[PDB]
Ligand binder design. Sequence first.
Ligand code: CLA
Ligand SMILES: C/C(C=C=C1C(C)(C)C[C@H](O)C[C@@]1(C)O)=C/C=C/C(C)=C/C=C/C=C(C)/C=C/C=C(/C=C/[C@@]12O[C@]1(C)C[C@@H](O)CC2(C)C)CO
Ligand SMILES: CC(/C=C/C=C(C)/C=C/[C@@]12O[C@]1(C)C[C@@H](O)CC2(C)C)=C\C=C\C=C(C)\C=C\C=C(C)\C=C\[C@@]12O[C@]1(C)C[C@@H](O)CC2(C)C
Lengths: 168, 177
Amino acid sequence: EKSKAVPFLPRPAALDGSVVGDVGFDPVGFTSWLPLSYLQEAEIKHCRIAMLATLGWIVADFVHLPGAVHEVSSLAAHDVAVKSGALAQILIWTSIAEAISVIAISQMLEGSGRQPGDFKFDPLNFAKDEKSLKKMQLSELKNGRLAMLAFSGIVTQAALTGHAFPYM
Amino acid sequence: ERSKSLPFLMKPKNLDGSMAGDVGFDPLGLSEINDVGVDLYWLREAELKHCRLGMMAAAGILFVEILGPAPGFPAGKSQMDVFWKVYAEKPSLIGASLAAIAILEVISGVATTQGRQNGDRAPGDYNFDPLGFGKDPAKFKDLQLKEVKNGRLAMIAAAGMILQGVSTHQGALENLS
Ligand code: CLA
Ligand SMILES: C/C(C=C=C1C(C)(C)C[C@H](O)C[C@@]1(C)O)=C/C=C/C(C)=C/C=C/C=C(C)/C=C/C=C(/C=C/[C@@]12O[C@]1(C)C[C@@H](O)CC2(C)C)CO
Ligand SMILES: CC(/C=C/C=C(C)/C=C/[C@@]12O[C@]1(C)C[C@@H](O)CC2(C)C)=C\C=C\C=C(C)\C=C\C=C(C)\C=C\[C@@]12O[C@]1(C)C[C@@H](O)CC2(C)C
């Protein structure tokens, strides 16, 4: 009762405390008719994709790969990269990763034990015990949400005003 | 048995004494509506939202007309017509404000319906007391009465300002003198 985020709204009844980044924020009750693991996986995937996208947009408006095709702004880079076939390679490998993801999310939903977003990818450690893993999961979630909103703002401002890196 | 405000009318059944500003002024018996998701809880929440919105709007009109606009913002003293001048030059501000108000209003409606269902939240309550001006009781009732009276007065005032600006196309205090 009385979820932490919205103090005047009831607790979403599906987010008690046992999830990283769980401040009880679900006013429209998306968790009431969708699996929690599915939504967590979707959120983490969005976080990672948008973090990479924000970093790439900002960097590519500064540094360009050698070649005349890579001499466009990130706003206009989509139509150039799709014509050159640059985005085709990313599409192919992302589709391979996403088919393996289809298998992984199916197994997670039907038992297994794989945590949402846990691909066990960890060449370095950066997370030795449970406490470090929880803290870094919270950091990843917060940074990913911030980067999703940041990429949203960057794209909207750049489309509104065709400016360089300062999209004001 | 008779309403305090209207002695020629019987006391409205649903308005005993609880809500701040209750004087029994329900001649049409609207407090007894229990249909289309509308009841005393919904009516009180709507009244409080109207009170707060009217207070904010009246304060904004008076502030802008007396102390002038903020730097970088248009002038004209007609608040119903300066809106189109702001939108003509800063449409993004208006759009962002509208989107924020839309999200907050969706949250407000969800909260109203939930609090009506599992009764734990008083109508118009959003737990918004950052400065702790209404922590203790015996002052909360007085603050509720002050808010309700000021909000009704500002509702009437803001409706008047809207109509005056739409019709006369002049400022509020311009109409005053
Ligand atoms: C969402 C991810 C994403 C997407 C869709 C793109 C898309 C694009 N980038 Mg880009 N970029 C990204 C992230 C991304 N970038 C990141 C994170 C960086 C920082 C290193 C850059 C740095 C960058 C530069 C410097 C340039 C581009 C350019 C371009 C355009 C054409 C060439 C190209 O594909 O990039 C080539 C990308 C690189 C050389 C660096 C990519 C490094 C990756 C993203 C990090 C490692 C992630 C890993 C491989 C994930 C594995 C995927 C899995 C399925 C196997 C194209 C529109 C070029 C352009 O035309 O600019 C307008 C260009 O000059 N990008
Ligand atoms: C279904 C729903 C929402 C909901 C729900 C949920 C989501 C299901 C959740 C719950 O469970 C139930 C329920 C029902 O709550 C309904 C949504 C509400 C609506 C339909 C929104 C309406 C808002 C309209 C407003 C507030 C417009 C005001 C216009 C003004 C104009 C201003 C002007 O300046 C302009 C522009 C020109 C100037 O010249 C002069 C004037 C004219 C003054 C003043 O502001
Ligand atoms: C800034 C913003 C969001 C900021 C979010 C932040 C900081 C989030 C922080 C967190 O996530 C972290 C970091 C960690 C989480 O655990 C906790 C929180 C705290 C939640 C959203 C802006 C959101 C801004 C929005 C939605 C603006 C919308 C504007 C519109 C629609 C206007 C459109 C128009 O103006 C045009 C474009 C042209 C005109 O011609 C037509 C019209 C329509 C007038």
